[PDB]
Amino acid sequence: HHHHHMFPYKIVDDVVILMPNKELNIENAHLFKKWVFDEFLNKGYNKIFLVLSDVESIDSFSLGVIVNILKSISSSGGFFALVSPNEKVERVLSLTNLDRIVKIYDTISEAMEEVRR
Amino acid sequence: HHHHHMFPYKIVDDVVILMPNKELNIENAHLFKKWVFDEFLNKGYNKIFLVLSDVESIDSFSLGVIVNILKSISSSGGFFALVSPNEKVERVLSLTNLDRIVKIYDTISEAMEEVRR
Numbered sequence A, B: 001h002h003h004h005h006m007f008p009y010k011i012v013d014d015v016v017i018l019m020p021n022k023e024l025n026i027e028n029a030h031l032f033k034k035w036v037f038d039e040f041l042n043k044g045y046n047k048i049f050l051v052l053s054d055v056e057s058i059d060s061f062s063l064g065v066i067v068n069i070l071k072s073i074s075s076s077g078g079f080f081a082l083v084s085p086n087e088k089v090e091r092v093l094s095l096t097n098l099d100r101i102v103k104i105y106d107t108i109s110e111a112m113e114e115v116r117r
Ligand SMILES: [Cl-]
Pocket: A029, A030, A031, A033, A034
């Protein structure tokens, strides 16, 4: 169903793997945030990988969305990880210290290994 | 009154000039945001300068607060400006493209000149 699948994802072993295939920025940030909350977080799915392989850059609005997800998941005691940030994105994650407060993995298999234990 | 003045500010000609004298980051971000909304934005003060002279660095949480203020002010048709970011802060503002969507001034007199016209 289209709205259920407004952005690409799959659920593997109670983990929601989000795979946006386009830029996450001011134009789509609120739409994406509302979708993650409505489809997953507000329905009790609080283990989420945000896969960034196809995200060219992030801006302050996409960072605000990441922060909002992180806050929700930290509050409920779930698991949040950023996966495969490119170099431009990783530079932003570093300079804003987000890499000190959220797990970041190079690959999905690495993230899966952590969430299992 | 202490809670009214939980952080340093002054109101000059219908402009709220916020002058945090310490770091704005994950530890104080929500407290600061709630204070700006409760004291100013929710009371109809939508012309705000966030003066950054004494803010050593910003993180993803303080950026999220800036974004939330910006969103509120853009929605209500007010005026928002960042004033006197240091080099570390300006690098974050640049790399996250915030400098493309919010006015940034070196000094308070420059900002005042814009808000007048
Ligand atoms: Cl949003």
